[PDB]
Write a protein that binds this ligand. Structure first.
Ligand SMILES: *[C@@H]1O[C@H](CO[C@H]2O[C@@H](C)[C@@H](O)[C@@H](O)[C@@H]2O)[C@@H](O[C@@H]2O[C@H](CO)[C@@H](O)[C@H](O)[C@H]2NC(C)=O)[C@H](O)[C@H]1NC(C)=O
Ligand SMILES: *[C@@H]1O[C@H](CO[C@H]2O[C@@H](C)[C@@H](O)[C@@H](O)[C@@H]2O)[C@@H](O[C@@H]2O[C@H](CO)[C@@H](O)[C@H](O)[C@H]2NC(C)=O)[C@H](O)[C@H]1NC(C)=O
Ligand SMILES: *[C@@H]1O[C@H](CO[C@H]2O[C@@H](C)[C@@H](O)[C@@H](O)[C@@H]2O)[C@@H](O[C@@H]2O[C@H](CO)[C@@H](O)[C@H](O)[C@H]2NC(C)=O)[C@H](O)[C@H]1NC(C)=O
Ligand SMILES: *[C@@H]1O[C@H](CO)[C@@H](O)[C@H](O)[C@H]1NC(C)=O
Ligand SMILES: *[C@@H]1O[C@H](CO)[C@@H](O)[C@H](O)[C@H]1NC(C)=O
Ligand SMILES: *[C@@H]1O[C@H](CO)[C@@H](O)[C@H](O)[C@H]1NC(C)=O
Ligand SMILES: [Cl-]
Ligand SMILES: [Cl-]
Ligand SMILES: [Cl-]
Ligand SMILES: [Cl-]
Ligand SMILES: [Cl-]
Ligand SMILES: [Cl-]
Ligand SMILES: [Cl-]
Ligand SMILES: [Cl-]
Ligand SMILES: [Cl-]
Ligand SMILES: [K+]
Ligand SMILES: [K+]
Ligand SMILES: [K+]
Ligand SMILES: [K+]
Ligand SMILES: [K+]
Ligand SMILES: [K+]
Lengths: 263, 263, 263
């Protein structure tokens, strides 16, 4: 077959896709991957070395405009309860009714004003916590239980040049340009504070690669503590103040990690 | 003398007052107070029991409009470096030039954009950290070193009905109405979220008085951990999310507590 | 160029030198030195082995007669406050006025008699603590935090044959002849007690090189304890009594190490 014909048909090999559909991805091949990876991770079979792991504040939002009803990059995407329910259908196509109600339940006990943005925000969190944040935090706990140093960050700066709308917040993919040092180029219309954040991140990544320890040691910076099961400290990355915090998304991940998999 | 004549002359018994002038306050009388209290605190001579201690996010701002030049409750109070320097004169009347430059130094290493509000914000912090926040945190460390449980909070909600302007933030005195439960009165034009914050605070204060432990135990609330020297955990009080944080104002209080007193 | 012409011009490559001017010294070349060394030290990138580190009691004095006003090797160098201030100019040429006042402040709170030698002594200490003693003690703490044994000494014997005057005390460079065993030569007009001190030092250095442990094990000598962050024990070297002491120059080094670098 010519390549186009393979590509054109890729989208349909699946009965129903989601916006995060991975039609063709990694498998347990007996070669690159000798067993189910959940089992390797659990039983400590992996390279012993240091890791640096992190997530952005609004991982799930990018995906809502590729299919969830009531969403648009061109308006404020205030959605109703019903639209929320329909969005869960779109993101959780093979899940029992009870599976879906349980998500609705975990994410809609409002605190508390009847804010119009309640449902729009809950859907972004749902998508981001299940698909990105809770699996990242779970890999870091399990990896670190076998003795190696790990460091965990939570990126909460929204690029001043972001072409997406405000409601989508600190989006998935939009730390990359900080890590690669784009805002160090003064000609580029990023702010002074963005220049400084990128410089500090670039230093911490570089020190991690060279020395295994993602510190910025010269400019009175906050020390990045190791992530240990038990305390679960992480470092926030932002323009205002860098903070040491504990137990990211603790209630949400208990839901995704210990209950949802049974469903 | 008639009372008016005593009152009229109270303001002048002092060569130069500040907006926080306490012309007539507590003294070491040999009776109520048997020694200099700094010495009692240091050497562990005080009632052994539990304490609950806290501060508001912008303690110092209320005072800037009673004398600092360039300030007004009726505009945004953008001040220059020079006006800052003059404000230090107003707040630190008996202090050497070097004493004042040292404050300027600690508080004006900008991060970093040349934001117009830099000087206005630094002056509020200066006034609040010296007069309220660092002495509160220091009393709590010293008290807790002798064995008793202590709990520390940082109140960061600005009342929706605050008649003062926005720049003044979470002002000194404006937690009181939350503690006394004014926003529980639905007729009063506070928001739903304010109602819930006040209800939770009132419960925590009440449980502290009855049981010595300022927990809200029924509504999946964040546990308030004891404040210990070493970890120095505190609880944030706000409408969005309640957090456990460590070492409030650590760099600023090291300045006020260990250096400024020598000056 | 002929060598003389390079040498003649070396002194002027610098806008203003101090008596400790190092016009041409080590650099981060990418070769011998792969990164800024403060960063290597902080992050534990160095040979892991034992170290022996120390300083003399009056490191800074030798330098005062190469430029500080009011100093002379031929008189008692009683200087005034003003001369002190001028000496700080000579030793701290690129430092802000505030930087200089802060030194004056740390070093001139007299205890307390108005002794005429107050200013002369404070200037020697200033020069010695900043340039030699606090950096030595800081390298030893940081080195030892990564697990290796370290030993720290404070040499306080003034050679009986010292051609410099008395006020200059236990000068920089004048332990060397003890380490190399010059006073073991009985023909040389050093005292009996100096002979014994040199013999003990030579033994301790030799045992350190051979065995990693700078003990003198045969003559009922004081054991030299390892220097650990936390306790910070050191050994004094003198003719009368050898002592174990803690936290050399603790108040002065807190000044040089944690505050002065910001200035
Ligand atoms: C925000 O936009 C969405 C997205 O759909 C629309 O895109 C808009 C920018 C709009 O101008 C229109 O061209 C396009 O249909 C709106 O969702 C749509 O809602 C309308 C109701 O009139 C329905 O016809 C559609 O079913 C629905 N489309 C999808 C894909 O869900 C949404 O109402 C709007 N919300 C606002 C302004 O809050
Ligand atoms: C904000 O207001 C201050 C306060 O002083 C003024 O109050 C204003 C609301 C104003 O309308 C006027 O009635 C009153 O004087 C301003 O500070 C003043 O600045 C002016 C410069 O024109 C000086 O004349 C005064 O010295 C000074 N007063 C004091 C007490 O400091 C300030 O300039 C203004 N700032 C803004 C708009 O950013
Ligand atoms: C100690 O000596 C200094 C050094 O300067 C002088 O050296 C002396 C030994 C002296 O005999 C003279 O030959 C030479 O000038 C004295 O400092 C000098 O003070 C004089 C005041 O008469 C000034 O003329 C100089 O500015 C100053 N020189 C320098 C280089 O600073 C100092 O007064 C003297 N102190 C004593 C005796 O306590
Ligand atoms: C450290 O120093 C200055 C700010 O005072 C700045 O130019 C530089 O970017 C900082 N370095 C890092 C790695 O953040
Ligand atoms: C607990 O329960 C409900 C919210 O579900 C609320 O009415 C009440 O105020 C809460 N109680 C406290 C003490 O916060
Ligand atoms: C030990 O013994 C004698 C003194 O009793 C002396 O001659 C010798 O120098 C001492 N040795 C050392 C290494 O100090
Ligand atoms: Cl329903
Ligand atoms: Cl490790
Ligand atoms: Cl915690
Ligand atoms: Cl200035
Ligand atoms: Cl108790
Ligand atoms: Cl911490
Ligand atoms: Cl003076
Ligand atoms: Cl060792
Ligand atoms: Cl001690
Ligand atoms: K968040
Ligand atoms: K459930
Ligand atoms: K704050
Ligand atoms: K200072
Ligand atoms: K000494
Ligand atoms: K200082």
């Amino acid at each position: 077959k010519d390549p186009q014909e393979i590509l054109l048909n890729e989208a349909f090999v699946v009965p129903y896709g989601t916006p995060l559909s991975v039609n063709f991805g990694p498998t347990v091949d007996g070669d690159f991957l000798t067993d189910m990876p959940d089992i390797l991770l659990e039983l400590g079979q992996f390279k012993k070395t240091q890791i640096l792991v992190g997530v952005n504040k609004d991982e799930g939002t990018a995906f809502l405009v590729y299919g969830a009803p009531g969403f648009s990059k061109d308006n404020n995407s205030i959605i109703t309860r019903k639209e929320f329910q329909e969005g869960l259908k779109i993101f959780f196509p093979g899940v029992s009714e009870f599976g879906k109600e349980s998500i609705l339940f975990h994410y809609t006990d409002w605190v508390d004003d009847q804010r119009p943005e309640q449902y729009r925000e809950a859907l972004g969190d749902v998508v981001g916590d299940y698909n990105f944040i809770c699996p990242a935090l779970e890999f870091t706990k399990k990896f670190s239980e076998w003795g190696n140093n790990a460091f965990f960050y939570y990126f909460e700066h929204r690029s001043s040049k972001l072409p997406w709308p405000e409601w989508m917040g600190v989006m998935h993919g939009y730390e990359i340009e900080f890590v690669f040092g784009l805002p160090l180029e003064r000609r580029d219309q990023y702010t002074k504070a963005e220049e400084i954040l990128s410089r500090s991140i670039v230093k911490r990544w570089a020190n991690f690669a060279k020395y295994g320890n993602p510190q910025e040691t010269q400019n009175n910076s906050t020390s990045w503590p190791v992530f240990k099961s038990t305390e679960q400290k992480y470092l926030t990355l932002n323009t205002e103040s860098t903070r040491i915090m504990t137990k990211l998304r603790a209630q949400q991940c208990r839901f995704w990690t210990s209950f949802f998999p049974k469903v």
